Amino acid sequence: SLGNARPLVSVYTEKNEPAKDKNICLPAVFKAPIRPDVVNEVHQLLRRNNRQAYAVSELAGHQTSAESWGTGRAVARIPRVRGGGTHRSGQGAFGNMCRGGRMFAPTKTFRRWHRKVNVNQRRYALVSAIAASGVPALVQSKGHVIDGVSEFPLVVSDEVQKVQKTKQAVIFLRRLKIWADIQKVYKSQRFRAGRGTMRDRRRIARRGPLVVYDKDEGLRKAFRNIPGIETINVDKLNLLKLAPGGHVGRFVIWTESAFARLNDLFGTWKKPSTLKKGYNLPQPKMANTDLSRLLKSEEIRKVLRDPRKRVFRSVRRLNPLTNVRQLIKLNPYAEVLKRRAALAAEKRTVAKVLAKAKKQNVELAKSHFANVATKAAANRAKLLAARKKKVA
Amino acid sequence: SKRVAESKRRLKKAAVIALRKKENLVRAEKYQNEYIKAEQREIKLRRLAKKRNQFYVPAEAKLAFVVRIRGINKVAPKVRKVLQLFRLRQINNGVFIKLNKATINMLRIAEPYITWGYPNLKSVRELIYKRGFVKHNRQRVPITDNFVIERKLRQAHQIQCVEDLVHEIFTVGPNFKYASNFLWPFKLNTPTGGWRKKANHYVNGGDFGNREDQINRLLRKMV
Amino acid sequence: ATSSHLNWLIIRNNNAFLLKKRDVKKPFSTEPNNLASVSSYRYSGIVHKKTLGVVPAADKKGFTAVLKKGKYAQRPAKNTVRVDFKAGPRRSLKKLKNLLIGSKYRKDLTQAALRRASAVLRSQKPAPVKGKKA
RNA sequence: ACCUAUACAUUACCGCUAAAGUAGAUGAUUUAUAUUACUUGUGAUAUAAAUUUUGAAACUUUAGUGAGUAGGAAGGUACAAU
RNA sequence: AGAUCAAGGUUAUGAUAUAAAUGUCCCAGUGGGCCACUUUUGGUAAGCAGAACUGGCGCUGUGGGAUGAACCAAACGUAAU
RNA sequence: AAGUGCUGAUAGAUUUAUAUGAUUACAGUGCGUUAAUUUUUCGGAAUUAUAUAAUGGCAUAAUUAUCAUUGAUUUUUGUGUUUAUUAUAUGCACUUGUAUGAUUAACAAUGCGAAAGAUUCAGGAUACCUUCGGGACCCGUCUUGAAACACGGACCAAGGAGUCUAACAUAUGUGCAAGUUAUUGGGAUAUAAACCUAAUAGCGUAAUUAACUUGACUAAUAAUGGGAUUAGUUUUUUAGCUAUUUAUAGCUAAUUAACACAAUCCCGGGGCGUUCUAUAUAGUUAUGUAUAAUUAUGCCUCUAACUGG
RNA sequence: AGAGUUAAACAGUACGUGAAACUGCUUAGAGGUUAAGCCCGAUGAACCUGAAUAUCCGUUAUGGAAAAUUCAUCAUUAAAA
């Protein structure tokens, strides 16, 4: 929508120089969508074109003359070698199970080694790489020591293209605080763990920055022998440089006249491009893309219904036939029938211990007459019934 | 302005929980006095019809209790289907069944894998109190209180208490179909003391088919 | 463009600091601004200026120099470098944790940051102790 | 009476399957207390202390459930290279 | 035989719903079967030959029948009771 | 059938409930009317009215409906009646109290992670040896069925078998969209890469005939036009629900109307083909014809074109 | 067999590593049953792994020292956010 949105990119020069009067505007590729899923899928494929053929000799296997010395000779049935006298006899020819014999399907030259990616999909893989070469969260997650740099995307003046001796390049990469990255590329010069070490790849290190110049006055020769850094020209812009491995966001350095051309290559949000015929910058599926302000939000939290705030687990089934406390929770009336028959069974044992007052007549001291003495005070309920129940 | 709202919720959820407990007391009191006037009437009718020398038949039984008794293999595709529809798919599962001509001819079909009989009130109670579970969107929720019957069945039937389940099942009510399909089938366990043959009829050996009063005495040792 | 959720789903798995270790289901970032060192979404190098951490010291033992986030004066397109500010409390082993709650109020890392400065101040101490047993 | 299965049952654990919940943390929540509007009474404000990220590809809750050749699908795992 | 109006009560046996409905890949394998109740044909009979139904074995362990592909119980995540 | 009144034993006891959500509703204890009654006297003890619909009991009215009907059973109740029964009328504090958050915790004993130094208690079929009990046939394969008196295998290390390609088809990912696709080439050029790019060319955009013919809805508009079954957005009024200023929302629907996506199910309509049929045809436009001079205009129409169901 | 050489001869011409198959010797325990192996429960011997500090009816009552302070009721001042 915008093309502006952070619309002032300061330019720096050789003495780390914040101050110009030249402040150019952010060239609107940098809002276009970062998509590492398409960048990885263009990278997977496009670097299959620097790739030449391996293939085994198509006569390996088959210049014996072995016929299957065939059943019934107590020995199995492979083609065995004919001769006698050379001790390669009979000895097993032609099969992949055999020593000497031809491999399962031998590798040919007309395997598809190279590939064609669609050319908009290259441009919508370069665009996501350029757009992620700003955004220093995604440079810093390639390693890339960038916490000395003073801007993103870092733009140096055009004068650095005239530099000519490499001593005056590590003077330059010192002053812009990016020497500490190419000092990290010195740290990881190692040896490979292959088979590389026999086959002429005895290592890389990691990558470093990428000086995107516009006109090599002497720049490319001046930055050759620094290990880690590599430069590029704005017209070319290889993707396999700007996202090494499928992984967006190499630490990049624009010069001034490099940076001022990106509003032509991939044109702008307003108009198409002039240097790429008919190209039109890709539109994201989600323009605002900040969820924590989308969910914040007061345009949405006047709709939301149910923030169910308990958990409600609390589960265990008790037993309402041994745990009495569940009976009175579940069938509350059944509490009554407990206090009715157990009260009525109380007076039964009261009556049957008074059957011993038929027999031995002992007490009745503080134990069982006191169980029945309350009836005499309970007589007053019937004695009030003759005087207080005659009020209505 | 939230704390004003919740403590009016919290004190109207209290008054409704209080107005269930008394309304589930005097409703269990009314339901209990039915089961005293009922069985005392059938004493009164016999001690009547003896002196008038008539024969008092009692009522034929509605409400069976049907329990799969035997085995999940070697079963034929028409006893395989009746016993699916009776929800009896394991050994020693039991469901409540309303008896008419239309399920009795289905208990006839599934007869050698089923023992059944007509249950006591004590048997109806002890099966939903000790073993009794409940369907909350296919989940088998236990009982744990009588909110969990008040939830799904008070708004569209008038069952809210646990004794309203027992009343809708002992007296086979209009909401019977709702309150047997509410209860997940009773996963009883194996009777202590045992079975007798499991695969000769109750009149010959003792299991499958109508026990018809002795589902109560079996369920004593099964629940 | 730039938001901590778009930035994170690019970084969620293909990171350079995330270094998951072998059984433990996907955690550990070795970031310089993590302070509860897993990889969450909001314990992270750049989550865009909720980026607090707790570093010692430089002078052990007294300090914990705290890199406080260098915030919304920055995009954080870089700064004529600012964006780590390093206000470092000192001099009292359990007063400064009140002076860190007192300092910041960015209530998402807050109890997981003074949970870390304690666990630095637990660690830098033990020089004149763990000695004699005579 | 009693003994006896990998069956039945109640529990712990593993998976599966099916549902359900959580993301305003310059927020939420406690405990006290100062003040307070005061509505009797309960809230709102200040103070002091306290708890409050999760590869949201996560975490939390709940229930059922588990035979398998030929065979198919998912998720891991060993080897070597870019 | 239809196209729009008017009237219609409480939706019209029972019990069930481990979700059902539908495309594509007609994708893999298979296209030698054997056993058994009851029915049955050829044969004198057969652990023979050939069919109808249901269930099994094949693919399936465990308990029982001393023993066993199919019998009788029972179907199988690791454990206690 | 009731708890009737218990007494014995057994095994078991998830839980980082904020390592992103009640420990609170319950009930239970300890302070603040009354009065006699009783009992022990050291407590307790008992007592009414205190407000119910009253539910059960009695009498009676009343009606729904019935086994059998002298009657009984009810049903709706209603009144009176007293006999009982039950619930509600316990705030404020305060407990180490009970419950409920898959209800295990209180008491003791034993023993010190013990500076290096070093014991106690539990556990360890790790991978074996010793001692017993139980179970226990040899794998791979074909087969209806293998421990098979079926085939291969004495043993061990290395090797060893579902691949590249071509062309389709479906599914999924991605880019652009009536389009798309550099890649045969060319250009720039940093190097068999990447970039840029003119004319085509494929495939799609329109089909059907053996072929020649012909070539897609009444219309400046229309998703199988129309019809059903439609998810969903708008909309209707109604009580109505939370908030209400009683404004404005959310809710069910009752229910009005509208468009009805997708998908399937029915009925059409067009293109082309084939066939019947209308034309008896008049007639529709021009050559011709009428004239002037291919030309101008008349108009009949021998001629071709054209209309029709 | 001593000695010597080397960093090393456990690198001495099978000359780097030096696996399995199979085995001479030492040590340990044991031996008449499925031929041996093996599963599961335990076992003797042997070796081994793990083990704990702020409370009942509280991170409460209360006295000693040390050091020191953007802390106070502190106050100004200087910043950087």
Got the DSSP string for B149-196?
HHHHHTTTSS--SHHHHHHHHHTT-TTHHHHHSSSPPEE--PPSS--S
Query: Vertex A336, ends A333 and A342: CA angle to 5°?
Result: 145
Question: What is the rounded distance in angstroms from the CA atom of residue A144 to the CA atom of residue A207?
Answer: 8
The separation between CA B80 and the C-alpha centre of its own chain, rounded to angstroms, equals 23
CB atoms within 10 A of CB C38: 15
Phi, psi of B147 (to 5 degrees): -70, -35
Q: How close does chain A come to B50, measured CA to CA in Å?
A: 33
Question: Look-up: residue for tokens 């007589």?
Answer: A379
Beta strands in chain C (DSSP E): none
How many Cβ atoms from other residues are within 10 Å of residue A292's Cβ? 15
A228 is written with which tokens? 């880690």
State the DSSP code for A371. H
A37 CB burial (10 A radius; 0-12, 13-18, 19+): exposed
Give CA–CA dist B24/A331, Å, rounded.
8
Phi, psi dihedrals of residue B182, rounded to the nearest 5°: -75, -45
Which of A12, A43, A140, A146 to substitute to test the interface with C, most C CBs within 10 Å?
A: A140
H-state helical runs in B22-67: 26-49
What residues of chain A, 251 to 310, have a C-beta less than 8 Å from chain C?
Answer: 289-293
Which nt is closest to the CA of B91, judged by C1'? D8
Residues of A in contact with B139 (CB under 8 A): none
Listed in sequence order, the DSSP H helices in chain A are 36-46, 119-131, 136-139, 167-170, 172-175, 179-182, 219-222, 239-242, 256-259, 262-265, 291-294, 324-330, 334-353, 356-359, 370-385
| CB distance B82 to B160 below 8 Å | no
Rounded to an integer, what is the distance from CA A226 to the centroid of its chain?
34
CB-based touch B/C (3+ pairs, under 8 A):
no
d(CA A340, CA A353): 20
Answer for the pair B210, B116: CB distance below 8 angstroms, yes or no: yes
List all residues 6 or more positions away from A47 whose beta carbon is below 8 Å from its beta carbon. A240
Helical residues (DSSP H) of C3-123, grouped into ranges: 6-11, 98-101, 110-121
Q: How many CB atoms lie within 10 A of CB B8?
A: 10
* Closest residue on chain A to C41 (Cα): A292
Residue with tokens 């004593």: B220
- CB-based contacts of A268, cutoff 8 Å, min separation 6: A3, A27, A28, A281
Instruction: Return the DSSP state at A156.
Output: B
Identity of residue B94: G
Picking from A173, A184, A57, A41, the residue whose alpha carbon sits closest to that of residue A118 is: A41
In chain C, which residue's Cα lies nearest the Cα of A8?
Answer: C77
Instruction: Please report how the helices B162-170 and B121-129 are oriented relative to each other, as an axis angle in degrees rounded to 10.
Output: 140
SS3 content of chain B, % helix, strand, coil (to 5): 45, 10, 45
A255, A211 Cβ separation under 8 angstroms: yes
Residue A161 CB neighbours (<10 A): 22
**CB neighbour burial string for B160-169, b if at least 16 within 10 angstroms, e if fewer:** bbbbbbbbbb
The residue count of chain B comes to: 223
- Name every residue whose Cβ is closer than 8 Å to that of residue B147 and which is 6 or more positions away in sequence: none
Place of tokens 């369907």: B135
Resolution in angstrom units: 3.5
Report the candidate in A56, A60, A59, A64 with the shortest Cα–Cα distance to residue A92.
Answer: A64
Q: Are β-strands A23-24 and A9-10 bridged in parallel, bridged antiparallel, or unpaired?
A: antiparallel
Whether A89 contacts A64, CB under 8 Å: no
Give chain B's largest Cα–Cα span. Answer: 78
Residue whose C-alpha is closest to residue B212's, from B125, B114, B131, B127: B114
What are the percentages of helix, strand and coil residues in chain C, rounded to 5? 15, 5, 80
Alpha carbon dihedral A251, A254, A255, A256, in 10-degree steps, equals: -150
Amino acid at A115: R
Q: Among B52, B94, B101, which residue's Cα sits nearest to residue B190?
A: B94
Q: What gap in Å lies between CA C46 and CA B178, rounded to an integer?
A: 59
What are residue A155's DSSP bridge partners?
Answer: A254
Q: How many CB atoms lie within 10 A of CB B218?
A: 22
| B-chain residues near A318 (CB < 8 A) | 144
Where are any strands of DSSP class E within A44-185?
Answer: 154-155
The total number of residues shown for chain A amounts to 392
Nearest-angstrom CA–CA distance, B110 and B118: 17
Spell out the residues 6+ positions from residue B26 whose beta carbon is closer than 8 angstroms to its own.
A333
